[PDB]
């Protein structure tokens, strides 16, 4: 499930 936020 990929990162959907602006930062990692």
């Amino acid at each position, epitope marked *: *499930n990929a*990162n959907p936020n602006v930062d990692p």
Partner: antibody
Amino acid sequence: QVQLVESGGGVVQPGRSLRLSCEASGFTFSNFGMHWVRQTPVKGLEWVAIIWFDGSYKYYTDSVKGRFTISRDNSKNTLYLQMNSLRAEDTAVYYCARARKGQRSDYYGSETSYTFDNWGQGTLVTVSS
Amino acid sequence: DIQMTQSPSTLSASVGDRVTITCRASQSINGWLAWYQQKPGKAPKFLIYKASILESGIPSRFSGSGSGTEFTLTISSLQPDDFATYYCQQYSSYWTFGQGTKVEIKR
């Protein structure tokens, strides 16, 4: 404090439409992806949809494809769930939730996966004639 | 697609007891397993992630273990605030939940 507040729930006839809203406070709304999740007493918890922080990507659970649309208005700090062609089986409490890294914050690498936390109080959608 | 099954559906316990709840996945989810706590009329609250990492602010009496397809949530010494329903959630491929385990008061 981080707070999400859902609104827009109510009684809607089968085949009709309804738009849910989720207003965010206590954080930079446009920095986070967001989710909708729903709950029924018998069937339990079911993830509904996800949207990227800037609206640039989104996807849905199979049972709502072609009928629900997730969107956001970052100028209003608000998340939306447009629900068209509603069915009895869409009756549920609908929660919004903030995307969450399911790994230590300091870890950087391929072994990472995301989930969601900080759910709101929810809003009840009742599809009935 | 990945089905989560919790056991038991309802568990009775006393304040001070050690409680363990089981969660089983239909296929390997690595360690991408989260636990939530829910009180009646309230939203689920994030407790544990990565099978065993405690979320900040969650009391140390909560612990999680497991790998592959078998996971456990343990409360070392149950307190009155812990009577609630607990849900596991895999977040390896999309997001799916167990049916929940309700922890009730033994008598």
